[PDB]
Design a binder for this molecule. Structure first.
Ligand SMILES: NC(=O)c1ccc[n+]([C@@H]2O[C@H](COP(=O)([O-])OP(=O)(O)OC[C@H]3O[C@@H](n4cnc5c(N)ncnc54)[C@H](OP(=O)(O)O)[C@@H]3O)[C@@H](O)[C@H]2O)c1
Ligand SMILES: C/C(C=O)=C\CC/C(C)=C/C=O
Ligand SMILES: [Ca+2]
Ligand code: NA
Length: 364
């Protein structure tokens, strides 16, 4: 029987894994599912038939307590991280988090088959504070080129993963590298779609034009993205397909787009006048949206929305870090050569995730 541990179940990918793993048509099903996060279970995560567990995986004592009784786990899906002010601090905090989970699950789960680790495109472009400032390999990024000669918590987690799986014979791993994720999660630390929806809603409320808060290269250069459900399918495929074992894979939608085109779609979905890129202007959402909490409360009250905190539902720093840089492309050749043919139309994915935020009454 298949039993999953989703580590970060209320996250942008964890929440897709919570909806997909229990479905009857899912490979290796029927799946029993345990979902871990620190907060109490939110209302928008309830619609999934998972066993929700409150646990802080940065706490070794808490991890030992909550996870040691889950002896029936066969597959681990690790979809979480902790942000710190520098990459060296991110290596320490994220290495400990992964090690705390693995040190407990491996000796306590005799039927444990696979550990799926989510990382990302920063494997190739570098940590947040070095992006655009270092020499990278040339795009499209392929999986097995050498690591950058700078600290990166993904390299720490991979090396920890490789040495952890040695403790159990027949234990396999996979690494999943998405770019910017289009998904649903009002609790995610990095939710571009959710943040853009809140921005569009505020513009509609204040009768302002939907100004583009990014650079020229993000506006009219090519971009790509990774649909959250597609990433969830990619985790599952690697977890059950023996030809996918012990490999790192990119996971992006299979097409490209331009923010210039998606700007129309976003404006049309919230009934706002479509603004554009302005050759001046250096617009930042972190600055534009400072002190909009009362305006968000007006929007919440007037449209019968779920009660959310502006700071949870709109991570302004992340939307600015995304739109103020070029989006170098990655390659899906390794995934496709291994039998994974999943893909998404990125524009349809974008509309689908906007509509999910609306359907859960997060935005108007
Ligand atoms: N989101 C993106 O656009 C994006 C793009 C590329 C790569 N990635 C990478 O994907 C990986 C996973 O991130 P994600 O974006 O999927 O995460 P996310 O959407 O921010 O979700 C994190 C999840 O883990 C939980 N969590 C956080 N800290 C925890 C802790 N100490 N103990 C237990 N649970 C904890 C969260 O709930 P609580 O806070 O309630 O605990 C939530 O359920 C990271 O390496 C990230 O860099 C993300
Ligand atoms: C390249 C791009 C947008 O244009 C967005 C990605 C920004 C990054 C790599 C943020 C960290 O996950
Ligand atoms: Ca990344
Ligand atoms: Na989709």
């Amino acid at each position: 029987s298949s039993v999953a541990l989703i580590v970060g179940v209320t996250g942008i990918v964890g929440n897709s894994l919570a909806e997909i793993l229990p479905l009857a048509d899912t490979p290796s099903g029927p799946w029993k599912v345990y979902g871990v996060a620190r907060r109490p279970r939110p209302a928008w995560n309830e619609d999934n038939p998972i066993n929700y567990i409150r646990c802080d995986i940065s706490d070794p004592k808490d991890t030992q307590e909550k996870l040691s009784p889950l002896t029936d786990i066969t597959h681990v899906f690790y979809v979480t991280w902790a942000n710190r002010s520098t990459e060296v601090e991110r290596c320490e905090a994220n290495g400990k988090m992964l090690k705390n989970v693995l040190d407990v699950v491996i000796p306590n789960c005799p039927d444990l088959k696979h550990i799926s680790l989510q990382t990302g495109r920063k494997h190739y472009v570098g940590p947040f504070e070095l992006i655009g400032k270092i020499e990278t390999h040339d795009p499209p990024f392929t999986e097995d080129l050498p690591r950058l000669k700078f600290d990166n918590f993904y390299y720490t987690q991979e090396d920890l993963l490789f040495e952890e799986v040695e403790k159990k014979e027949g234990l396999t791993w996979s690494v999943h590298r998405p770019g910017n994720i289009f998904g649903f999660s009002p609790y995610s630390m990095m939710n571009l779609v959710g943040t853009l929806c809140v921005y569009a809603a505020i513009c509609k409320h204040e009768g302002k034009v939907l100004r583009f808060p990014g650079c020229k290269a993000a506006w009219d250069g090519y971009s790509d993205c990774s649909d959250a459900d597609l990433i969830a399918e990619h985790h599952i495929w690697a977890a059950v397909d023996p030809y996918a074992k012990n490999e790192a894979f990119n996971v992006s939608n299979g097409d490209v787009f331009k923010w210039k085109h998606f700007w129309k779609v976003l404006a049309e979905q919230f009934g706002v006048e479509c603004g554009e890129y302005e050759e001046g202007e250096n617009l930042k959402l972190q600055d534009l949206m400072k002190g909009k909490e009362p305006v968000w409360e007006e929007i919440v009250r007037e449209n019968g929305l779920a009660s959310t905190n502006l700071e949870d539902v709109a991570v302004w720093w992340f939307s600015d870090a995304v739109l103020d840089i070029p989006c170098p492309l990655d390659s899906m050749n390794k995934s496709k050569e291994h039998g994974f043919l999943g893909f998404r139309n990125s524009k349809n994915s974008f509309i689908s995730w906007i509509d999910k935020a609306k359907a859960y009454k997060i935005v108007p």
